[PDB]
């Protein structure tokens, strides 16, 4: 803002203070924060100055060479946008596959379309991964644009007092963006919300001219009050445009309760690492007329060694990738 020149686009361009992906020659990923006037170490592959890569587009490979080395366009490294795909891959490389419930890129990609995820939708979500699912949703809805004019929201229902959304610290989202597009509510506040009466007995607002400590003790209470009021708005007769879930809670006695707040004709997608889990859910939903034709889906990707003359699928790879339970909320006659 203090520059006369137009800002750099961090969606297209390597920019200061962005969290960014770096692919090493060994093909594993690192996440790197681009603090001005600092250096970054890649162990055996050398170190480089952050300033020397700013302003380039993503997808380029830089060589580190020595007369902390210098960088030129091509040991070496490749700099990529921190996409939902790349974040998942980083977590897998890091060894956290069980923390992401064994999910794959194709399974999450399918979940996004089965769930009909759109910029203007309000989606009900459970995410036990630390926010990876939330991030897949947000990146598809807004593309990482903190200035999006779209009004869509992800409402995260969670098991503990607070939601675990720690992965969003890598997302390059402003606090404003997050507050506008992500709402969190515990399972207890969602299924047994406080009444307006119960809320008011703790605080009712004043009819602005406050100052000092009085202004600050008041707005903290008013903050609590607005939180409570948000819960009222989200738990009333409010109806959501879809339900997406990656939780290890017991689905057969959880999903029917969540689906009462979903509008008719909206998709429901439950991700699960184990098909037997979804099988039990599908049978439970078969006998509930509020659910249309629950289906268990599986998608698996097999890459090829893609060099001309020696074309063949990869000979080994990791198993897993999980399964999707897809169905639609409907209204019985």
């Amino acid at each position: 803002h203090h520059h006369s020149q137009d800002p750099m686009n961090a969606l297209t361009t390597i920019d200061f203070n962005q969290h960014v992906i770096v692919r090493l020659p060994s093909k594993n990923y690192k996440i790197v924060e681009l603090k001005p006037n600092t250096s970054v170490s890649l162990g055996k592959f050398g170190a480089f100055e952050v300033n020397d890569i700013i302003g380039y587009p993503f997808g380029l490979t830089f060589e580190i060479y020595y007369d902390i080395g210098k960088v030129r366009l091509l040991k070496y490294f490749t700099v990529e946008y921190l996409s939902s795909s790349n974040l998942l891959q980083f977590l897998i490389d890091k060894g956290d596959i069980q923390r992401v419930l064994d999910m794959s890129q194709e399974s999450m990609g399918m979940l996004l379309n089965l769930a009909n995820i759109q910029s203007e939708g309000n989606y009900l979500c459970m995410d036990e991964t630390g926010g990876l699912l939330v991030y897949f949703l947000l990146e598809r809805m807004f593309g990482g644009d903190n200035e999006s004019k779209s009004k869509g929201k992800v409402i995260v229902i969670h098991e503990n007092e607070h939601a675990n959304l720690d992965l969003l610290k890598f997302a390059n989202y402003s606090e404003k963006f997050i507050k506008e597009h992500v709402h969190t509510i515990s399972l207890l506040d969602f299924f047994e919300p406080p009444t307006l009466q119960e809320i008011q007995s703790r605080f009712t607002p004043l009819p602005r001219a406050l100052k000092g400590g009085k202004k600050n003790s008041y707005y903290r209470k008013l903050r609590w009050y607005n939180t409570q009021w948000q819960i009222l708005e989200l738990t009333g007769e409010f109806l959501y445009d879809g339900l997406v879930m990656a939780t290890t809670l017991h689905l057969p006695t959880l999903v029917p309760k969540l689906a009462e707040k979903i509008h008719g004709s909206r998709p429901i997608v439950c991700y699960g690492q184990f098909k037997e889990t979804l099988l039990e859910l599908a049978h439970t939903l078969y006998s509930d007329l509020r659910f249309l034709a629950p289906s268990i889906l599986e998608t698996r990707c097999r890459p090829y060694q893609s060099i001309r003359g020696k074309l063949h699928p990869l000979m080994t790879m990791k198993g897993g990738g999980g399964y999707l339970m897809w169905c639609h909320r409907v209204i019985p006659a």
Binding site: G121, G143, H263, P267, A293
Partner: protein, 319 residues
């Protein structure tokens, strides 16, 4: 776009998808004087209009349908070749990181299956159709669905011979702005579903974004086609090239009767002295059952990326 957003109530004139069964989904435009017929009965529209989307509709001599708002996934299941199904398309979109930031080139339009999925999330879609008659049909459909008035452009074009440029005078839905004689496609996402994608790739340099990573996916049924594609991609400077296949499966949730040794023994002892699934007179075990027929191959997916201006503004960084 009647595929986009979230309607509450079914209205006269609305395009709906009426779910009859898993393999039977029909597109039906509501009209108060019309009737929807299935092999199980007749459903007058006036008994549907005014009800919420997602309503189960019942008639006696009881038969049912469910009336749904169109979505790309359900639309694709309703269609009767040139079809990209959701396992391939959702993967392609995820790997190329589709979002409102995306500006995509699609050729060819084919069934329009992929076009509807793109349109839902992309900033803009530029679709190209070779066949003049398929062009006209796709145009009329995209218009009726509301795609053309939103974020979709379709153009009649042999992209292998004539490239991707859209100029005033061309057969296209494109609405030219003030002082615009040509569209600036500025594509950062390219999907090619063509007989010979390697004839089209050379034309991409004129229409792709030049200051960002551009992603490309080529959709080809045969390995020989993949081989020719890998070759041209290398020649025109595309990198991070990788071919993959996607395999989708669907399972039914079923039950197998529990038949004990003891009951088989008791039956044999008796001999010696001389049914619907789920039946509560029996014990059952839940089992998953694979779809009868599987799509064991749709196409090989070849992904590639390009950056044209492999440079930075050295002095603008200095400031």
């Amino acid at each position: 776009n009647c595929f986009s957003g979230y309607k509450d109530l079914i209205k006269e004139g609305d395009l709906t998808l009426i779910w009859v069964s898993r393999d039977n989904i029909k597109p039906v435009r509501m009209h108060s004087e019309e009737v929807f017929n299935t092999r199980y009965g007749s459903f007058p529209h006036k008994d549907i209009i005014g009800k919420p989307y997602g309503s189960q509709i019942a008639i006696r001599t009881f038969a049912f349908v469910h009336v749904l708002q169109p979505t790309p996934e359900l639309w694709t299941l309703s269609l009767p070749t040139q079809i990209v199904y959701t396992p391939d398309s959702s993967y392609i979109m995820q790997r190329l990181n589709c979002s409102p930031h995306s500006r995509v080139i699609e050729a060819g339009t084919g069934s329009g299956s992929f076009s509807h999925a793109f349109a839902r999330s992309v900033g803009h879609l530029f679709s190209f159709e070779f066949h003049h008659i398929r062009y006209e049909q796709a145009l009329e459909e995209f218009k009726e669905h509301g795609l053309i008035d939103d974020n979709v452009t379709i153009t009649h074009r042999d992209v292998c011979q004539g490239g991707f440029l859209i100029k005033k005078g061309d057969t296209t839905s494109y609405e030219f702005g003030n002082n615009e004689t040509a569209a600036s496609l500025n594509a950062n996402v390219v999907f090619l579903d063509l007989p010979a994608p390697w004839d089209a790739i050379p034309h991409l340099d004129s229409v792709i974004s030049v200051d960002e990573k551009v992603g490309l996916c080529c959709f080809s049924p045969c390995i020989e086609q993949v081989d020719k594609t890998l070759d041209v991609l290398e020649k025109y400077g595309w990198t991070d090239v990788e071919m993959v296949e996607i395999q989708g499966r669907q399972y039914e949730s079923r039950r197998q009767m529990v038949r004990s040794l003891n009951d088989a023994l008791e039956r044999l002892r008796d001999i010696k002295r001389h049914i619907k699934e789920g039946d509560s007179n029996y014990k059952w075990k839940e089992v998953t059952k694979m779809e009868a027929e599987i799509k064991s191959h749709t196409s090989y997916l070849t992904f590639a990326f390009k950056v044209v201006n492999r440079s930075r503004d050295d002095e603008k960084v200095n400031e």
